[PDB]
Amino acid sequence: RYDSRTTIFSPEGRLYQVEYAMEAIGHAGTCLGILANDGVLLAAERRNIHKLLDEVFFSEKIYKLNEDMACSVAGITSDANVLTNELRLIAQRYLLQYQEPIPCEQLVTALCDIKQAYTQFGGKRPFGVSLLYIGWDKHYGFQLYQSDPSGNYGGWKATCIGNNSAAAVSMLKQDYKEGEMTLKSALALAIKVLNKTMDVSKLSAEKVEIATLTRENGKTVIRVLKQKEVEQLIKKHEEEEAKAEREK
Amino acid sequence: LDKQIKEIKEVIELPVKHPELFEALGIAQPKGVLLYGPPGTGKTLLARAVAHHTDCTFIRVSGSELVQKFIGEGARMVRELFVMAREHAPSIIFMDEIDSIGSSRLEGGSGGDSEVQRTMLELLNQLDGFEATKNIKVIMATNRIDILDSALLRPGRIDRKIEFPPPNEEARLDILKIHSRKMNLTRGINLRKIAELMPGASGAEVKGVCTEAGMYALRERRVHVTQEDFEMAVAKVMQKDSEKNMSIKKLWK
Amino acid sequence: SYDRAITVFSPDGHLFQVEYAQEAVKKGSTAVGVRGRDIVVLGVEKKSVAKLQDERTVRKICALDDNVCMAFAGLTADARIVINRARVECQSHRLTVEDPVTVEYITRYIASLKQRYTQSNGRRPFGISALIVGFDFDGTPRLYQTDPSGTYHAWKANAIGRGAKSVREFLEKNYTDEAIETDDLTIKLVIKALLEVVQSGGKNIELAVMRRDQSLKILNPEEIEKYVAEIEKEKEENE
Amino acid sequence: TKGPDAASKLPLVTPHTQCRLKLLKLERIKDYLLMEEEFIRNQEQMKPEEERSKVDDLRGTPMSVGTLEEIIDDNHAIVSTSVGSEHYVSILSFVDKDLLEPGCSVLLNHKVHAVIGVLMDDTDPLVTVMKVEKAPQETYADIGGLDNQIQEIKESVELPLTHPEYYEEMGIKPPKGVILYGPPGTGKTLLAKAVANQTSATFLRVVGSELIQKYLGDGPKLVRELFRVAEEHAPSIVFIDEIDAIGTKRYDSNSGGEREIQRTMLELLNQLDGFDSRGDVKVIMATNRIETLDPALIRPGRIDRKIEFPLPDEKTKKRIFQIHTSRMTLADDVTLDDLIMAKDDLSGADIKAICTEAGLMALRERRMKVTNEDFKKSKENVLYKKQEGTPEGLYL
Amino acid sequence: KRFKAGDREVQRTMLELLNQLDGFQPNTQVKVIAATNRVDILDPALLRSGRLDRKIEFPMPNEEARARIMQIHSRKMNVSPDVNYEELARCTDDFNGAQCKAVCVEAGMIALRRGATELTHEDYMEGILEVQAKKKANLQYYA
Amino acid sequence: CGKTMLAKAVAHHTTAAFIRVVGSEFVQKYLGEGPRMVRDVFRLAKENAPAIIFIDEIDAIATKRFDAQTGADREVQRILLELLNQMDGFDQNVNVKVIMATNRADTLDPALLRPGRLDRKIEFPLPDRRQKRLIFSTITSKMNLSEEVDLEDYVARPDKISGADINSICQESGMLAVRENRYIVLAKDFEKAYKTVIKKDEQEHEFYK
Amino acid sequence: PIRALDEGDIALLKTYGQSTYSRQIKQVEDDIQQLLKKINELTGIKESDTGLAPPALWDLAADKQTLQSEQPLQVARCTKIINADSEDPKYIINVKQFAKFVVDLSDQVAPTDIEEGMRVGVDRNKYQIHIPLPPKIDPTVTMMQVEEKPDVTYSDVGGCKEQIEKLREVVETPLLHPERFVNLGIEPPKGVLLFGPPGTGKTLCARAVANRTDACFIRVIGSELVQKYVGEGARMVRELFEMARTKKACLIFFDEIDAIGGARFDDGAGGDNEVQRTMLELINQLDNIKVLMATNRPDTLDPALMRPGRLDRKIEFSLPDLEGRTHIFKIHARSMSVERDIRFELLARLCPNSTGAEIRSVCTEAGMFAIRARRKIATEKDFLEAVNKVIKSYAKFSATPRYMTYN
């Protein structure tokens, strides 16, 4: 067998340790980004919703990198923490050196460059955490970026990771909307997919986290929705669902 | 399992009862079926249902019955099993728990199965080998399908590989209605609601829920079961074991 | 038991870990590159669109310098790092020596960078073999092929990735002087070379052409489509 | 040398559209079979004694079978009773003293033990069943593709028997021993059934598991008897299917049951290449795993040709489809190329299962003419057991 | 050791043997000895008081013992007067006494191959190399 | 906590044919002897019906199935599969009840925890302040106890001592009374024995805590 | 919604669209099958003659007299003579399987003819010795020795000159010139163990020995030395060694010793210890007789059997060098119809780490290729093609995309 070290090449040319890190994201949480013009969002899930969990951060799965960048996380907690620390440090280094915000891709390229280095040098376990990126820049505007524990990344319009990733991406493709992807429709689609990809039904507001990024007067306000607006969003989805039963 | 019964009758009953359809169509008769799925779904209940209405010699080879201490004995028993099935043709062999004998071929050596491997290879040749077999069909049922080798699961031996997924709501309601037909249900017991309280209940767990609902009346010396007798019985049968450790549970964000 | 280390020689003098590195390229998408008289065209096949992802972040043909470009194979994770290292190296060489890099020099640098990764334990080789093709030679076109081991070779035309054997074998029989006599014929040579795709769809073929003292020009999916149609019309002669 | 006891195959009819000429050929075969039956039955009925009768009274009933161990005199011998004892028997006159050889099975008088016959052809019924009497009905035309593979097996088991001059005029000893290895469902046992349908030599078949026995001495003795029968019966072919059952890699086993496995393997090795050279008996072995066999078993000299059966190519898959859809009733819209072009690892057994499933979906819709949609459905309903296992989007 | 199988015949032999060792008491002239190359598979019932007892321990010969043993099994052969048996012992390690005689036998055989009467030290060295089936090749990278 | 003792009581109180087998008894060598032993056990229950099969310490041979890579785990998984087949298979056994005792309850194979094979998963927890009183009363009912021996002061202590520990506390106290040639167990012996059965830590290493 | 095929649909499916000749053709086919069955039944029982002599050599009148007068005598062995008074000895006889008895002579045979241990013939009634018997010769062990000398000579074994000389200096030289081994006082090794990779020429060198032997060569099958009944293998090897001792200058060759020479381990609850005890009896016999053994896995043999008291010499058959590979090619191409320009030296370098059997396969496959295309001379081009498919096609992968590193 050829998965003893992350630098061992299998006879078929497959990095077994890397793919072991890749498939381990199935144990990570569900975070998805829906198609949206003039905006973009991530929809995370809180597995640990135990009542004895006091809530202090409200963004345990949502992290802000730059003034115009936000990222989710799906992987080992410690790896996600160190990766987001390096993310913020690299973004601020770029801001200091160029006096200009990082243009989305070059930050994701920076993380993927750091991440792949763990998959090449021995003695370091590959970073077993994949993370979405949202952001805006003067080059391509709103973008959605998919990190992958192999250091491979990719532009995306609608994708998800974590538990039930395949079901989430298939459902996002079922109603995949190009162009006509207003922020309200994006939020509705995010709630609609989260209703099914999450095993627990009724989509309790406290167990669902949405973070949105919008361009308002050239400020790029990054928003995390409080309990009230998430409650009214799931209420809207519930009222919409009631109409769908008129077929019978 | 209405689809599964109809799919399994296209191999067990149709090729035997009316072989003229297959000869006229110009296709070979399907031979083997593999009923795989989570435990408690009906993969062995379907075998009993098939044996109840089959009008063919139904041989049952369940578990490690072909694994003998003496070498070359399990292969001999498989040979005579297929000999007895041929003189009594048409015949149907049902091999429950095929993982016992049909697991993936391990590398020969100190640590590795080699005799159960040998009876497995004899069976492999018996299903599809030099001597073509006539009117012999096998319905071996398993739980793990990925542990079986490529040779035992290759077509020509297993034409249909029928899956037994956990029943849905409209199916669990059906299971609740066939295992409670003899039960003295009261008025106002919505069997669909109890089915709605069992997401992914295997199928044997529905029967367990019915049995425990009856048990909750046995300890009270009654004959009728109420809605609360079922709802308090669902939580008993459909019990879950949590991680019981947030430190391990927060290993992954 | 001679294949779980990179610095262990097999009884027959084989670096089996190095050989397993050449398996990664054989799993990657087919990339073909042929050198013409004035237009050095390189093409890649099996785009494999996921129908939900923008293709800008998928790019596989990248220009190391203003006059050199390279298309890789194998895993993209190491490909991006070798991309950045080659870009930094060519800029640094332009800094230390006023003359910009030549294709052979950048190929040698990439080969040495890979070799220093295949030479020691605790460092996995770059699992790619890139096609170094460019017109920075100031008059004479050259195209090169690197290897994950660290060996670089100069070919008149090459083929890497999943389908290297078939494309290479078919390419010998139709690579002659008359074929390369015209720039349009030179690009059409890439067109029929990548036409032997896994599915031969014809819409997953991305070809880039660089000319003498010109800039890199990735063919838009209207000129590429036009060239595919022209090749089909030429191939319509069989009827 | 009793000669090649080749299998009895009736002449083939090769209209397959169920036309009248098929009936004419089948009726011709039926008329000849009826005439042969008339000949034999009328020979028994039409047919309506002192020398052999005295012999049969002398022998009596029953008539035991013992093993000769010593010819003491020209009229006296020592035989072993079938329990294991010994007796100083007398040799009677009608017994032919030339066929009387030590180790042979002799007939003994029941009351007064004495050699009264020689029982030649005393083959163990575990081996007389190994001989193929009814040939398989799969000709070489029933295999699509594998032209290279067929040619390799045809130059070692058929050509050396039809044109031995080619081999002898050049100085070769024709290849004697081929191994058929590859993924499951590629056509190895099909090739065995195809050569058995065309060879003129006796074709012994074994799964490599009949030749393994619980008794200590029975295992290697059975393979020795099998090869003795193969050599006795002139040109012969021994097809050891699934050789991985017995011929696995040797190792220092701490189990007695496994040590006999290697012991009968080591007699299969001896019977292939040992001190005494083999006769005119070819050996065809088949296995799904060639990397597990012992190096000595697949060593050249024992196995000369390692015929590899890779998963069928696009052209080979297209030919396999036509082979398996020849008896179908395909619709005019059934373009099989839609299913062949798929990059799925489709074996020949996969193709046959697709054809059977595609026919069954036609019966689902009350049709005996399969359309293109039936095939596209049967492909999905049959392509299980392999799911989809591949690396993710690491490589570009 | 103990394990109806077919070994129930030698078992009676071993038990009868055990009965006779315990039947006779010491101080009589019936001292017994037994030899075996594997006591790991020996039934410890055989190794009990009143039975065999006093397990004598036979080790692999050490360097001086190996030299001495190689000296004894060459007395009948015309060995040259100048053969360093001590150096032979240094070059012979992990060698049992049987191999320490086979080295002398092989040295004599190699001397016969060379067509010489007396056995030189080089003949003994080649015997050491050949008793373990090794072939001596002059490797070029030493010099 | 009384798992084996309850099965013993059932065996003493059953009109059926009790058939006890231990989990370790099915792990015989000579592959095809363990599963054959399971087949013999269930068949023997079958002719002499009604019969009850008590399989104690099933965690030995009924651990969760996995991808075995040697005959060692393959055989024990085969024993588990034979258990699954004989407890609920194509041959439904009637009037054959099975009691099965384990100390883990989570390593058990999910197919064996089905509510068609093991319907009732009864839990035997550590005795509380109420059950401990009953256990002390039943064990000491036969023991000769001095009137000054008040059992309540020992059942009220917060130490989580098991029923086996309770029986230990009683038997060793009686043993200590025997050692001093005294025929009546005194409260001093009870207190002395109580300290020797609850100090289970003893060794430890003081750095795991 | 897989609607079940009802009877009305079934009848239409079996009738509508049917060819008018389908029913008749199928009936004719079933009639053909049944007719074939019954006709093979009518004549399947073929006569199996029981080896009757020609009627000319028949004496039925005296044959009946032989049947009635002579009686079957049970073969026994006289284990002990009691000699109660030296006039009524009261011999004790072993009847092998029946039992052990104390019997006396019949008046026909003389007291002095029956000596202890020799085989005796007793009657079925009183078990009296009626006739002496010659010593037992095993019907299988007698066949074990090779009466026909193998045709392969020493010149057919190439690339193993050192191994051939090391084998000869033990097997042939001590049997033909027992004077060089006496002058120096060297005890000639009484056994070698030919070991090496499969196909290196271990058994070929044994056939070469048998061809030039001047001696009595015995091929030990190995399969026969493992019998179902307990103790029969030890008896087999005992009488094998006894017959070898009776012959002058006997050679024994235990081919594939691993069958009866596995490493010893305790397996009493089974038949493994039977061949184990046969191996122990063989070791006892081993420690003018010379013994040969060949094995491709010498690490599975018992260390006691490999010690230099039973196998004094261990010859290793390694893979031949280039010079030996050309010699093997020339030996295996002496009878081939090759063109007289063949660079066998060039062909040897394209077969690195190749056994002597793979070179024979390459030579055979060159003619195979020269037969595939109708050429009566196998040119050099075929030999390269034969090498590419015998050696390179199964040596390793070493494919071109990964072989661009060696140049």
Ligand SMILES: Nc1ncnc2c1ncn2[C@@H]1O[C@H](COP(=O)(O)OP(=O)(O)OP(=O)(O)O)[C@@H](O)[C@H]1O
């Ligand atoms: N689909 C179903 N419909 C009705 N009853 C069902 C169904 N599935 C399970 N049951 C009930 O649950 C019991 C579980 O036994 P079953 O043979 O179905 O188990 P299994 O897990 O499929 O197979 P196995 O015994 O081979 O592990 C059945 O005997 C039956 O009474």
Ligand SMILES: Nc1ncnc2c1ncn2[C@@H]1O[C@H](COP(=O)(O)OP(=O)(O)OP(=O)(O)O)[C@@H](O)[C@H]1O
């Ligand atoms: N080239 C081919 N042409 C036609 N049919 C083929 C071909 N290859 C395989 N098949 C089909 O595959 C089916 C499976 O039987 P086959 O004898 O090929 O199995 P196999 O490869 O020997 O199997 P295993 O590896 O399990 O022993 C056959 O019935 C045959 O119809």
Ligand SMILES: Nc1ncnc2c1ncn2[C@@H]1O[C@H](COP(=O)(O)OP(=O)(O)OP(=O)(O)O)[C@@H](O)[C@H]1O
């Ligand atoms: N040195 C050699 N010179 C010439 N031919 C050779 C040589 N070695 C092997 N061969 C040829 O290869 C064949 C291999 O058969 P052989 O009996 O020699 O094998 P073996 O080494 O005893 O094998 P195994 O270890 O499997 O018993 C021989 O019959 C002979 O034709």
Ligand SMILES: Nc1ncnc2c1ncn2[C@@H]1O[C@H](COP(=O)(O)OP(=O)(O)O)[C@@H](O)[C@H]1O
């Ligand atoms: N309720 C109880 N009353 C008396 N004794 C008990 C009780 N529970 C456990 N014991 C004691 O604990 C010991 C262990 O028995 P038990 O718990 O049945 O087996 P296991 O430890 O395998 O579950 C027994 O000797 C028994 O005397």
Ligand SMILES: [Mg+2]
């Ligand atoms: Mg079952």
Ligand SMILES: [Mg+2]
């Ligand atoms: Mg097969």
Ligand SMILES: [Mg+2]
């Ligand atoms: Mg217990």
Ligand SMILES: [Mg+2]
């Ligand atoms: Mg040999």
